[PDB]
Amino acid sequence: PFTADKGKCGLPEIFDPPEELERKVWELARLVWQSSSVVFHTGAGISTASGIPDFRGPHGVWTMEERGLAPKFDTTFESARPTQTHMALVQLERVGLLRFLVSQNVDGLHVRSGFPRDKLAELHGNMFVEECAKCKTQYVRDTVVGTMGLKATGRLCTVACRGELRDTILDWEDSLPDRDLALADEASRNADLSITLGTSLQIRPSGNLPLATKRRGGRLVIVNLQPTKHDRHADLRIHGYVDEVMTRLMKHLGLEIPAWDGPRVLERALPPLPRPPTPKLE
Ligand SMILES: Nc1ncnc2c1ncn2[C@@H]1O[C@H](COP(=O)(O)OP(=O)(O)OC[C@H]2O[C@H](O)[C@H](O)[C@@H]2O)[C@@H](O)[C@H]1O
Ligand SMILES: Oc1ccc(/C=C\c2cc(O)cc(O)c2)cc1
Ligand SMILES: [Cl-]
Ligand SMILES: [Cl-]
Ligand SMILES: [Cl-]
Ligand SMILES: [Cl-]
Ligand SMILES: [Zn+2]
Numbered sequence: 001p002f003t004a005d006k007g008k009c010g011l012p013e014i015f016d017p018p019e020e021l022e023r024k025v026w027e028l029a030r031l032v033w034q035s036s037s038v039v040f041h042t043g044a045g046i047s048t049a050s051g052i053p054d055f056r057g058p059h060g061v062w063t064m065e066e067r068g069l070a071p072k073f074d075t076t077f078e079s080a081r082p083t084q085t086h087m088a089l090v091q092l093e094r095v096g097l098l099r100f101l102v103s104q105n106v107d108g109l110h111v112r113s114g115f116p117r118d119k120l121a122e123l124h125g126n127m128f129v130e131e132c133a134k135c136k137t138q139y140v141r142d143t144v145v146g147t148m149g150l151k152a153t154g155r156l157c158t159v160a161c162r163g164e165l166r167d168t169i170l171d172w173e174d175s176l177p178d179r180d181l182a183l184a185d186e187a188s189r190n191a192d193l194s195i196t197l198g199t200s201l202q203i204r205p206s207g208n209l210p211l212a213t214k215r216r217g218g219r220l221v222i223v224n225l226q227p228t229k230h231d232r233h234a235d236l237r238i239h240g241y242v243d244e245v246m247t248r249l250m251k252h253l254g255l256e257i258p259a260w261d262g263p264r265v266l267e268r269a270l271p272p273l274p275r276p277p278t279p280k281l282e
Pocket of ligand 4: 094270271272273
């Protein structure tokens with residue numbers, strides 16, 4: 001807990017020059033167009049532009065702790081808005097270009113963006129989500145569940161049960177939820193494209209899921225400001241702000257980034273919306 005390996009912290013940031021960055025996002029667009037099953041893996045870097053600091057970045061939680069300083073939050077979790085990145089991911093699922101979303105993030109922003117829960121694995125849990133120990137019924141709350149570590153919240157199951165409700169926030173020693181990891185693992189293995197956004201890929205087995213896509217000829221894209229455990233295994237690495245990358249990419253795909261009507265929970269993905277015809281590639 002206190003001695004817990006926090007991994008490589010505060011590594012230098014890489015910025016692709018604008019010309020190289022434009023070319024790689026066009027190449028990313030080519031890969032999304034060519035791919036039959038695209039899986040997205042997200043981590044703390046997709047939430048930094050909403051004022052929620054990451055863990056291993058220059059001003060990350062663990063980086064700042066290492067130097068006797070504190071992380072700085074520019075929002076509460078409750079007042080945090082989905083980024084352009086979050087909202088681009090909502091649209092990519094709606095138009096059938098996203099098969100599955102795997103996230104290490106406990107910040108609740110995918111759920112709140114209105115991203116469908118049945119196409120999302122929340123590997124490390126969700127601040128806003130409590131679960132009944134007896135019937136496993138989950139509750140998505142409008143405020144953060146006050147505890148961490150799979151502890152009693154003080155609330156009780158209301159299923160037509162009075163089961164003890166507990167947080168979904170893994171402590172260091174806790175293994176990943178078997179449902180989410182199993183779905184994340186199946187998505188990643190079956191994927192022919194795995195795109196990583198704002199994760200250093202340092203956590204096992206979360207960070208290892210995208211590598212599973214490489215088995216059977218799959219392509220791995222890594223979007224991150226810093227180096228990542230698995231840079232070597234990437235078909236493509238894009239060093240830039242995940243919002244610049246995703247807004248440029250949406251523009252190439254001919255997709256708008258949808259409006260956020262405030263916190264909304266969608267349990268089941270809706271029928272797929274129309275999308276632009278694919279460019280001629282080869
Ligand atoms: N706007 C941005 N655009 C692009 N990259 C960014 C941006 N902001 C930050 N980054 C990058 O975003 C990356 C985020 O790296 P890490 O901080 O390790 O977050 P994780 O989600 O992988 O952390 C995994 C778990 O570890 C913890 O213990 C918790 O349990 C976490 O759930 C960095 O490399 C930045 O360079
Ligand atoms: O696994 C975890 C469990 C709990 C927390 C707590 C707060 C926190 C801090 C951040 O800078 C980002 C984030 O999304 C959450 C963080 C990680
Ligand atoms: Cl903190
Ligand atoms: Cl829809
Ligand atoms: Cl904790
Ligand atoms: Cl198009
Ligand atoms: Zn119950």
